Symmetry: C2
Subunit: 365 residues, 2 copies
Amino acid sequence: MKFTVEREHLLKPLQQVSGPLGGRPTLPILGNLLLQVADGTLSLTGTDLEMEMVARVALVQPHEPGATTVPARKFFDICRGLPEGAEIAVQLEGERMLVRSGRSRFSLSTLPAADFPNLDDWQSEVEFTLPQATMKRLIEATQFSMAHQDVRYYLNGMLFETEGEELRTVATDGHRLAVCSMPIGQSLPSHSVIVPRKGVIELMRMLDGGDNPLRVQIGSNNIRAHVGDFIFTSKLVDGRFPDYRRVLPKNPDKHLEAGCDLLKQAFARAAILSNEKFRGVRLYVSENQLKITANNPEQEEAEEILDVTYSGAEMEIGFNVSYVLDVLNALKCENVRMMLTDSVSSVQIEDAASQSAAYVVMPMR
Amino acid sequence: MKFTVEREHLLKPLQQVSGPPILGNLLLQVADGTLSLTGTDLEMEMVARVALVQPHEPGATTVPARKFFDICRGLPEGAEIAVQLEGERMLVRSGRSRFSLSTLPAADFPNLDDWQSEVEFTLPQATMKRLIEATQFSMAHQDVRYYLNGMLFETEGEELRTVATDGHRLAVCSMPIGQSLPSHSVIVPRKGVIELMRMLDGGDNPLRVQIGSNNIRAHVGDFIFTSKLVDGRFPDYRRVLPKNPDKHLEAGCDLLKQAFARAAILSNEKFRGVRLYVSENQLKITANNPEQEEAEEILDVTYSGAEMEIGFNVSYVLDVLNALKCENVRMMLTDSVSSVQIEDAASQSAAYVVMPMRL
Ligand SMILES: [Ca+2]
């Protein structure tokens, strides 16, 4: 195996395929990247046994076919450290891979390509193309509501749902929920799958925000996304996601509307004097007014009064202020609508301008 | 105690006095038309003053520093902040935002003992910043030799000089200040050096320095920083500088830095060192690790002297090269077991001394 590539043609690919890797690989080969030269192309693959990221880099300089694996961090740092425009010459020599550029020489220890863990083959059952921006919107709208290391393995990930001309994402940690739906313009069969947390983040970070379309393929137990010369593949979380439809408040007849930033800044100030562990704030709603209060065990007190639009009955309700701030930070819009029922029921929060995303936050004692 | 003040006028002062249970509080004092804010950690203190034009009433209290700063910071740009003391609570109001903070009495707030100035001089902010930036990375952190966890400030002739060392590497920098000065040396604790550094903002502003037997004070604008000093036997940099180097290496800072950084990738991850081989017009830098991986860099350099091999801790060399931020570097060597001197070729304001590493 031999290739010579310009530094900047290798740097972004190396950074991308190293995504799935950790600082402390469990076994050595999992800290390596698979390098394959075949039919004028260098392929680079990184994996954590659950997902893989693959990059294809075209070879315009002389090359010889073959494959090996080498340490990802060392190989990336070498390439990054070389001067702008450096020509990077690589040659496999059994148990070592040699890297040369100018008068800089490096010998890296290899492990066989034949030992590199391969994701099993599988069959696609649904396929569609969509703008990068749409997948970006779907994930960013909901990512923050995924659980982190919950004993309920099914929540440590994101539901992707195809249904007719709609792609939908759902995320929840049992305390708060986020759902986002976007049109696609192909009619799709009904499928519902759970993408693991780590894979959601990798998918999000592979979107460059240019005009390249994203092509998605989904099987019973795998998902694949192709963007430019990058291919992301992940195993799915083998679980049944609880139904989002049943957690949305049934008849939330008390509607409040107010400016997003005015609400965000008031909650952020009140939060300063909320319980350090539990982060509780109290909302008192009355005619065209929202009063937010916080107090801590030290008997310090914050109060914010805001002009809003509200004509419903007076009520008082408590929330974890971090859950509320997470929603407001994800909306990034002019005005917010909050939909309430009573002091012991969830609130539904949406951008005033659109029902495409919705958030459900349970109240706090 | 009562005052009303623009948020605008409090922000920078609050930032500075938070620099250093009652040590988690800020002391607030209204007197003679001024609000003074003080933060301390018992070893040092920072004082900021702000003028009060709106109706105010004298008095003092202490309040949680981070909460008060965060409240002020979180209010909208242009906000007016009205404060009113009421027993064990301090009331803060701006628009229809209202806060009640728990207080501890001003009388409980620690004061540094009174002390007397023995040496005094004024110099530009910029000169003090340069002196600290040039040397601070060579301070020890948590050495049992406490007097190395800090920085020497020395007056000699018309110069102010800083010296820092951790026993393995040393940094020294001197600047003229245009006054004849007495010969004098004190050690400032590392946390004080850092806080002093952070109080200086790149403006053209005179800085007034007062040194006592046990304290140092610096006044800039309406900020006053005071620290205790460290009492110990600081090494003489004159005895650390190589007496007679007979080997001279010159190269571009960037080329040297980038070669060192690359070679270090395949050094031992726990103690990263590289080997230098110097010969006629050439530098070779090599590294290896327990996996038997190897790096080699060859550089065209200016070199005079006998051929020799010598090792270095990468981080010590990179720290120096990062503090030079200039075109050409000189390394002055003696033999494989002796320290080297590193300097900018075009400036004699600063010098660095680094022990070799055995590989
Ligand atoms: Ca104003």
